Symmetry: C2
Subunit: 368 residues, 2 copies
């Protein structure tokens, strides 16, 4: 009964760490700072990743366990208002970090970028703690921060006219519609991409490896005829054989140059998407109860005041839902535009490289 | 058997059709004519084919079956001396294609092309002439191992030593090439299946995927995507086109490489028997010493076998000279072709991607 907690609380409580929301050139949005700071992670007694925020140049170390602590806290606090991606995972008991730390740096960056997650006490303390006590004390301030769940909305304050159930309801279904559809759209590119990946690093190269060796085999036999005029052709035929091997290799190592990234971007968004279900659920559920406000007023189970607060608070929720989406779409555009451009360039360079490798081999052949 | 029949034949009578062999600067070889011709096979009441020998404009029409008859006859007559390549919408076109090449090989062979059977097959004015030539060829008892009797090498007789090693060599080369061609033919067919099956479907699947996404991206109601989502949908189509390219590519190159290696597989399938024939000959010529001491053959009889098996060798080396020279020209040609088409293929993909890339604004 948390949704009823925020919708019916006493609320004599005024937020300290107020989270602003405004209406930019188009739709409600978060108040983005003007000092965006990222944070490096690397330099691997257990595994202790070193976080180096490019903002104070004061390092801090954390073991994976700590990250889960951070994610969990973030999830519990802003989880019902903002999509909190999922941390990677420890493959086996030991390549590993290469695909792990990689996804960890990303996770950190995303968090860092978010105009709200970053300015959060809990995120700060995680990055800015001086000693064992300072850390332990902070690592307990959060765990006890009752300002979480649906309650997070109360700390938010939008500077715009209050919304109404009609429009509010549209945005919710609107959002749930787009996200669900995307998760499918993304889920598919992933499927296909993973298959193509298997082929490009699997059988495809073998085929070229095969042809390349077959050619050379022929050439060598051709050279065992003692006929006048073999040197020219045989050599050309051989180098060609080798060229295909080079090509096979070039093919096997190609996915990691491009497909990989397209694939990563999608996994990352597949994650964000995997969060909206529970977010919308909360919004829908909230909207429903508000609808039951009138019937609750007539039955005298709540006063007209209680109803006002319910609307005012559910209306706030809408603003946050949109403020976040604006953040979501904003990044989507930039990210997909970048990775796909990147994927395309790399491809071009790839095929161009093969073409030339052939031209050379070609020009090695005689004319008869 | 017929081997002994030839090596120890009576003889004393030179044949009518004579096939000369001379040793030029690069070993023995057939006598190539001054003006080599060719033949045309096209223009399709059962199915037939019109053969127009560029030599002297005057076509004749034959039904595939007639060709089969020709293959047989050729094989029976020059088979133990010369490799006879094998015979074969898609069907009638390939068969017509394969028949053209087949016909050309024959026409460009110094011995075959000038043979009575081959000639008459090309120029018969009516059923009478035809059925006649057909009966004469079928009864041309100058075939098999006897064919060598019609050959006259203009050079010193060879020795059982060189003849042998020369023969072995030929078996070792042909056999190896045969194994080498079979390997190439295998991987080529595999890669063909790939390029025409899965691979294309993958790009196809990716192309669609992109489009589906772009579409969804449009239902965001957000602002600015007009440029982006448009470039995405375009790129997706690009891949869908690329898919088609990949699929229709083999016919443009791989196809030919295969045809070349297929034709030679036939050529190489004929050597087992040819070499077997020669090898068997060398043995009969060996036991001669025994056949003499045992009063089986006269001293003269032996000389005939030696001198005669010398002719065989010359022939072998003459055909080999023919074989190798064309192998070189054929492989170099087809491979260049494969490479050319390959380059065009990849540059085409590169280009189509470059276009899709342009539609994507920077940032």
């Amino acid at each position: 009964p948390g949704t009823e907690q925020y919708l019916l609380a006493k609320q004599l409580a005024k937020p300290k760490e107020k989270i602003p929301i405004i209406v930019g050139d188009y739709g409600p949005m978060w108040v983005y700072p003007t000092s965006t700071f990222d944070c490096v992670v690397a330099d691997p007694s257990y595994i202790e990743y070193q976080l180096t925020p490019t903002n104070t140049n004061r390092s801090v170390n954390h073991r994976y366990k700590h990250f889960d602590w951070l994610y969990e806290r973030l999830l519990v606090k802003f989880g019902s208002a903002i999509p909190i991606p999922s941390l990677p995972d420890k493959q086996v008991t030991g390549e590993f970090i290469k695909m792990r730390m990689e996804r960890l740096q990303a996770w950190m960056t995303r968090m860092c970028r978010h105009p709200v997650i970053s300015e959060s006490e809990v995120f700060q303390q995680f990055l800015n703690f001086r000693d064992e006590k300072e850390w332990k004390t902070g690592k307990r301030k959060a765990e006890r921060d009752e300002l979480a769940g649906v309650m997070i909305f109360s700390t938010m304050e939008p500077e715009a006219p209050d919304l109404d159930l009609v429009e509010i309801e549209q945005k919710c279904e609107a959002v749930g519609k787009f996200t669900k559809a995307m998760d499918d759209g993304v889920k598919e590119l992933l499927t296909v991409g993973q298959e193509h990946w298997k082929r490009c690093t699997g059988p495809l190269p073998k085929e070229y490896q095969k042809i390349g060796k077959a050619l050379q085999s022929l050439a060598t036999v051709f050279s065992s005829s003692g006929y006048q005029g073999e040197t020219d052709l045989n050599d050309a035929i051989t180098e060609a054989g080798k060229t295909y091997e080079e090509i096979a290799s070039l093919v096997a190592e190609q996915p990691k140059k491009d497909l990989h990234f397209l694939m990563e971007c999608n996994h990352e968004y597949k994650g964000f998407l995997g969060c909206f279900p529970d977010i919308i659920g909360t919004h829908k559920g909230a909207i429903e109860k508000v609808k039951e406000s009138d019937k609750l007023v007539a039955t005298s189970k709540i006063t007209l005041q209680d109803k006002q607060n319910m609307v005012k608070r559910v209306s706030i929720m809408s603003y946050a839902l949109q403020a976040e989406m604006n953040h979501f779409h904003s990044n989507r555009i930039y990210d997909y535009n970048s990775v796909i451009r990147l994927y395309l360039e790399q491809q071009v360079q790839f095929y161009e490289t093969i073409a030339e490798k052939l031209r050379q081999a070609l020009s090695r052949f005689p004319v008869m």
